[PDB]
Every structure is written in structure tokens, then in C-alpha cells.
Design a protein around this ligand. Structure first.
Ligand SMILES: COc1ccccc1/C=N\OCCC(=O)O
Ligand SMILES: COc1ccccc1/C=N\OCCC(=O)O
Lengths: 114, 115, 115, 114
């Protein structure tokens, strides 16, 4: 599993459950095209987005549908989504974890590359 | 100044100076139109991006070019940029400050919205 | 103003107003002496905690009373307080801004240190 | 395992390995007294700090020796440590994860309570 995503809720102190996550890869022009997607588990994790064969060098955008998440909880959100854009495999393949921490008017994201 | 950006560097404990910022606005056809752009000052602030007349309702994206910033400091970062997408002025005009805190493999962004 | 604190609220997208802050300094006997205290203004800023003469070298702790803040907003938070402990002025005097971003189960703090 | 700690490095994009973590419980006066301690694993995690029997309601301080961590990497740090102070079991016992994300001049911490 070369790309994992983990989403935490800073208002409730819990994983962010059932959050929709869409991954895009940048194409020959510049257009963003869909690559992978899923919903966070009860642990706030999304595994099996890709396989190593499919996850080649490139620029990727991970867009976290945080707006719908807060909306489901009846909380007023600021962002349309959180968007994490990065080059992967700059030097061949690695394991990537993209972690996001969500609040209504703020978010932070970090990458663990191993 | 209805749209301001403030950027800090968490490695060096300082404002993030001369960071490129581009602001786009979603167009009728679901596409991102250039809206405004600038570079942060020695205080890590970017003022004068727009005006209250030009800053109408819409969905805006503030892209902070964190990759050039880190490279111009000699360091290889993870992110292509730090992005913040939000709907603005939907219930009247508001003043927005977008603050971002940068590290090479992480960033944080917050919006302070006042009336 | 060699020691300033700025506090934001990430739930409401605003400065965190009337937040109590206490600053302690480690004493010769390894104990925390009261140094300064105040409350943030409507801009979430706390100025005038100290003076450059009083702010000598040492290890300081800035305690931000996030628990009272959240309670006075009607909400049950995780942390007793947000704390930041750092050595100051060890290689000459410096100006420090301690910025903190608050959520009920999380907080972030950054220091901006200028010369 | 009712108290876990996880520490990530935002400069290197990796778990923060071999970081010393000291937990204290507040006593009848106010004095802080040692309760638990350990070093982060290769995954940046510290498990087995306590057991449920031992981890009762109270105020706890988790102090993360971030200064020595950066020092070991030859990077100049700002903080003496990161300190996370919280009431636990306010309403009986829970599982607590305290997560910290470290930079030389910044840190963020969040609690996942389950
Ligand atoms: C803890 O502060 C954060 C800020 C932004 C993104 C992530 C974190 C924290 N932890 O991420 C790791 C979560 C986990 O591994 O369970
Ligand atoms: C303090 O923690 C932060 C995390 C992410 C982005 C901003 C901050 C803090 N302050 O931003 C305000 C900076 C200022 O207005 O001096």
C-alpha cells in the first residue's frame, strides 16, 4: 500500500469517519484526472487506494471532502475541501501517508514518507 | 483590505518572506480564473491583493508557492504548494485573513473572518 | 514589546478574545516563578506583558488558559491549557511572538523570533 | 492500552524516532509526579506506558523531549519540550491517543479519544 490517507477531527477528538477522499494525477497538459478514491473507515483511514504498479512518479492532488463531513455533523465549515498536492517518487517509489487534521476554519496536513 | 495572507516559517521561526501567492476564482464554467497574485513582504504579509469592489461572492483558491520558497532556501520540500479553497462573501462582504504555517513536509492554514 | 502572544480560534475563524495567559520563568532552584500575565484583546493579541529590561535570559513557560476560554463558550475541551516552554535571550535580546491556534481537542503553537 | 503517544517530524516527513516521553500525574498539593515514560519506536509510537488499572481519572502532563530529538539530528530547536496537559476519564475511562507534530519552532498536538 504505497498511498494511505488518515483524517482526524480536532473538534470532536476523533478520527474523521466516512470522509470522501479523491486523488488526482496531473496529465500531459496540466489537467487533473481522477486516479483513486474512497471513504475513511471508523479509524479515519483510507487504505487500498492504489497498488505499487499503478502508483508511478507524478504530481498528485489528494482532495478531502471536509465540507460534507462537517455538514453531516451540523457544524458550519469554511473550506470547500482540503487539498494536498505533491510530487511522488521524485526518487523512485516510497510509502506515503498523508495525514490531515480538521477544524471548521483550519486544517493541517503532514506527509510521512517511508 | 478584504483579503490578506500571512505566511510563517516553522523551521526558522520567522515570517516567510518573498513567497509567491496566486488567488483564483471559480468561473461560471467550473474552471479557475486568475483573480490576484502577489509576494509576501518582510513581515510575511501580503496586502493589496484586491479591493472590496472586485472581491465579489464566489469560490476562491489561494495557492501559496511553498515549493519555490523552500528551494530558494536550499531545501527539497514535499508539497507542490499549500492550497486553501473556500466560498467567500456569500452572506454579505467579509474581511478574510488566510494564515499559513510552513514546514518542509507539513503545512497548516487557518482563516480568520471578520465583519 | 519583546514578548507578545497572539491566539486564534479554529472553530469560529476568529481571534480568541479574553483568553487568560500566564508566563512563568524557571528560578535558580528549578521552580516556576510568576513572570507576567494578561488577557488577549479583541484582536487576540496580548501586548505589554513585559519590558526589555525585565525580560532577561532564562527558560520561560507561556500557559494559555484554553480550558476557561472553551467553557466560557459553552464547550467541554480536552486540554487543561496550551503550554509553550522555551529558552529566551540566551545569545542576546530577541523579540518573541508566540502564536497559538486553538480547537477543542487540538492546538498548535509557533514562535516567530526576530532581531 | 489506554494511553498512547505518537510523534511525527514535519521537517523530515517521518515518525520521530527515539524521542523520550515523560508522563506525570498531578498530586494532592499540585506537585507533578512521574507516572510513565518511554521512547518512541521506529513508528514514532510509544505503547505500554500504562495499564487500565493504573490509569485512573486525574490531570496528566505528557512532556515530549523534542529538544534532544532535534539536537540529535543537528538541527537548532526552539522549545525545551512540548507539553500536553489534560484531564483524563473526566467521565470514566477512555482510550487516549496523544499525537504531536514537530518542527524546530512549532508543534501541534491533538487528542483522539475513543
Ligand atoms: C498531531 O498534529 C497533526 C497535524 C496535521 C496532521 C497530522 C497531525 C497529527 N498526527 O497525524 C498522525 C495521526 C496518526 O498517525 O494517528
Ligand atoms: C499560531 O498557529 C498558527 C498555525 C497556522 C497558521 C497560523 C498560526 C498562528 N498565527 O497566525 C497569525 C500570525 C499573526 O497574525 O501574527
Amino acid at each position: 500500500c504505497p498511498l494511505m490517507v488518515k483524517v482526524l477531527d480536532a473538534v470532536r477528538g476523533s478520527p474523521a469517519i466516512n470522509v470522501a477522499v479523491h486523488v488526482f494525477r496531473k496529465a500531459a497538459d496540466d489537467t487533473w484526472e481522477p486516479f483513486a478514491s474512497g471513504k475513511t473507515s471508523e479509524s479515519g483511514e483510507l487504505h487500498g487506494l492504489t497498488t505499487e504498479e499503478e502508483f508511478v512518479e507524478g504530481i498528485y492532488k489528494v482532495e478531502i471532502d471536509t465540507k460534507s463531513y462537517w455538514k453531516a455533523l451540523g457544524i458550519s465549515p469554511f473550506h470547500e475541501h482540503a487539498e494536498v498536492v505533491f510530487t511522488a517518487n521524485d526518487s523512485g517509489p516510497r510509502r506515503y501517508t498523508i495525514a490531515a487534521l480538521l477544524s471548521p476554519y483550519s486544517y493541517s496536513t503532514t506527509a510521512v514518507v517511508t
